[PDB]
Design a binder for these strands. Structure first.
Lengths: 53, 51
RNA sequence: UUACUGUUCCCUGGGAUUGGCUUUGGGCUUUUCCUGCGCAGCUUAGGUGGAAGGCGAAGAAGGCCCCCUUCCGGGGGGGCCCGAGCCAUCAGUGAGAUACCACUCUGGAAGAGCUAGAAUUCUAACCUUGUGUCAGGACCUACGGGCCAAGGGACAUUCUCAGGUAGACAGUUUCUAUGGGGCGUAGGCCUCCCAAAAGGUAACGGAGGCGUGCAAAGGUUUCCUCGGGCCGGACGGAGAUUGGCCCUCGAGUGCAAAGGCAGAAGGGAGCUUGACUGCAAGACCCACCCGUCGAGCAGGGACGAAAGUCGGCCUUAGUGA
RNA sequence: CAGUGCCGGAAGGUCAAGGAAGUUGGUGACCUGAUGACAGGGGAGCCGGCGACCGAAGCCCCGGUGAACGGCGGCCGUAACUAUAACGGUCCUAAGGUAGCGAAAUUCCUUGUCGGGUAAGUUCCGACCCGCACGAAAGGCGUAACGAUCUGGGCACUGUC
RNA sequence: AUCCCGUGUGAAUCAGCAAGGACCACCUUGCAAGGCUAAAUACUCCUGGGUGACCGAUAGCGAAGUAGUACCGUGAGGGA
RNA sequence: AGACAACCUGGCGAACUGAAACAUCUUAGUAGCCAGAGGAAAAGAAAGCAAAAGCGAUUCCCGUAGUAGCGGCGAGCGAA
């Protein structure tokens, strides 16, 4: 019926699958909620933090 | 079987004096198709009113 | 209660809670091909365009061979060999080259995207447990809270939507005349009697049918008379078809009865579509609703030579606001 | 093991919500006809209609299961006198009642017929089976003991008479 | 159609968005997803004045004295 | 904090009844129950009506009007 969107993440730690600490490979919102955001492992791409830093 | 069915003329959607399709109630047709000469259509003389 | 409409428990699917890896793998694509028996023919005419030039020796015709759809008719290249051609308007031909390609087709592949479904697992969501550990003035081996551990695990749980589904539960209905009942019958329309010579008239009084059918069994013009007894004619008889007399309406009319109808309203033949449109003075019936008949007018016709007749049927039933 | 219930099964058919190729409609910048008082066609955008195909359980289907629901038949004929049916054929079902019981808390006819008990017994007991309309866990047939149970008879006993 | 919610998807800022009864085009009107406000307004367990073609002890409040009292009910409550 | 007759707001929310039965509908978002709060409460300052003419927050009364409608187009319901 419907598909849920994909949320952007910017890394802070080496993914054992795809990304080494700095890539912008966007995966899933639930993979950010349950796994990446509590473990200090990814962040949300915001223009206030990415563009000026 | 005695199917009820409508006879109809030739359509001619035009802007004449009330020109429109004319269908008439008729019965008995469980046979070959019978166009009868029912008339006084919107065009006043008419023949071979089909179906 | 297998009456109606539902509800609930429960089950089952789409969403959400809901994520990670790889396989099996159905539909779309990311480029190229093997690929096509209407014709006379070097040839199994892939619908179009670029068309005197390409493949070539970074090694072409023709001989050694693996493979396949197959109408085994005919083809493709992997290896080796061979050593300077395959032509190109040719005449056939709506449309042409197996010199060449941008496209792309009935069939599939190469490595890749996208989406199913199903399966494998991991833990981080979520669920369960812990007389495992820590905690305050003290305990929580008293529910519980933090931490840790184990078992599951994107399943289960919860929510919405959708299908199914239990009188478990809820609201209801379950006719009347009658014999004031199981056991029956009928409910509406038409014909005769009862019905007492206008019309009407009841009873679960006496008898029957109807819920249609006909492109003619409607319309018009025209012609004709059936029905029964007797007599004649090796099929053929009591009785078929034919001839003649007698009785003259007893026959017939799509079907029940009544009233009608004999040169007919009964039977046949020709032409036919009035089994139209817009109507309509006045009547009958009349609780209302309804229902029935109708002179006459206009248009456009059918038959007939005309006169005239025709707004369905000899009429009354064949129906529903 | 037919119908119903319950269980199991997956091949197929039917199949909701929803997804979706495609098709179609309205409006519409713009282009055309127009002795009419207007009209025809239509890009994109927006709003819709139908919808091939996918789409689970249920249901149809298949197989099992009577201490699951329940049901367990008619028709006649023939054996050395009268009989009666061991036996036979036929129709229809899913199958046609097995042991035991049987005028019974079940029998309408019926106070069936016989025997016992009684002077006399529509009540009682023992039999036959013509079981209107017994019957095997809605169990069937029995029995010791028991019952303010029902019912038949007898002794003693008495105003019940 | 307007308005508000349940599940799920999910915009634009004024060159816009919403409404004008499906919807589209033009025009008109207004600026949601932030809050607060007196008056006119409805009523009487009452209070203070004025009335009554309202009652006069079976009436008027149930109740003109102990009146929600005696009495009844376990109680809710009923009730002179 | 608790109490408060009625009005008011918010939530749960019927059924007898009417339809000459009854299920859509009505009775009815009424009664009742709970919560809250004031002498009033709610609402209230246009993402509003209207129609090419115009008005300017909310509330209440007369009217339109028993009109337009809605409805087993029944019983009834009824604006702006």
């Amino acid at each position: 019926k419907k598909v849920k969107k994909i949320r952007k993440i910017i890394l802070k730690e080496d993914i054992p699958d795809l990304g080494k600490k700095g890539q912008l490979l966007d995966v899933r919102a639930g993979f950010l909620r349950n796994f990446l955001l509590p473990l200090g492992k990814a962040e949300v791409v915001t223009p206030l933090l990415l563009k000026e830093m | 079987v005695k199917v009820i069915l409508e006879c109809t003329g030739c359509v001619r959607k035009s802007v004449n004096k009330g020109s429109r399709g004319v269908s008439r109630y008729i019965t008995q047709k469980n046979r070959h198709n019978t166009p009868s000469r029912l008339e006084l259509r919107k065009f006043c003389p008419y023949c071979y009113k089909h179906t």
